[PDB]
Structure 1
Amino acid sequence: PRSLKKGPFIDAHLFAKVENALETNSRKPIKTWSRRSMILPQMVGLTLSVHNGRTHVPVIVSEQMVGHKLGEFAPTRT
């Protein structure tokens, strides 16, 4: 998957976005096209909408989804 020494990958334009959402504790969907980012424990409980190739599918982050990519939950094919 990824070397542990290199640390968990998080996109530059997503780490700031979730950081700003923590301050307001908003529940509005966060529109993102970056599904390569890993799910951190700081984003548990908030809702963000990942691109599926066509639209932005809403995903509600739970405690048992930390450690996965955002694209795990945005199916592309039918």
Structure 2
Amino acid sequence: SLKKGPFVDGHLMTKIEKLNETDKKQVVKTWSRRSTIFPQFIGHTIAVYDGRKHVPVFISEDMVGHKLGEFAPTRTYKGHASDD
């Protein structure tokens, strides 16, 4: 990125804000993987829309600046014939 600053679409902002202030709801899908993780966002688990299937993702304290959608690879491995 650059400066001022990391950019969530902003709906995730109010969502995680309301989820932080109250309710403590867990597991929620999102199509907007472009959004970066935030300190207020910590500890939540989001189903990430790779396209084929949502992949749930827990948020450790260590991850912030990495993109939220980065953790789930759309790519399928490998695929190769004769292993070993």
TM over 0.5: yes
Rounded to whole Å, the distance in 1 between the matches of 2:28 and 2:22 is 13
Amino acid at match of 2:29: K
Runs of 4+ in 1 over 4 A off after TM superposition: none
TM-score (norm 1): 0.87
**Counterpart Cα distance in 2 of 1:68 and 1:11:** 16
- Give the structure with the higher percent helix: 1
How many aligned residue pairs are there?
A: 76
**Offset of residue 15 of structure 1:** 0.7
Q: Say what the alpha-carbon RMSD is for the aligned residues.
A: 1.3
Contact 1:27 1:47 in 2 (8 A): no
Residue in structure 2 matched with residue 3 of structure 1 by the alignment: 2
Q: Which runs of 5+ in 2 are unaligned?
A: 77-84
Percent of aligned positions that are identical: 61
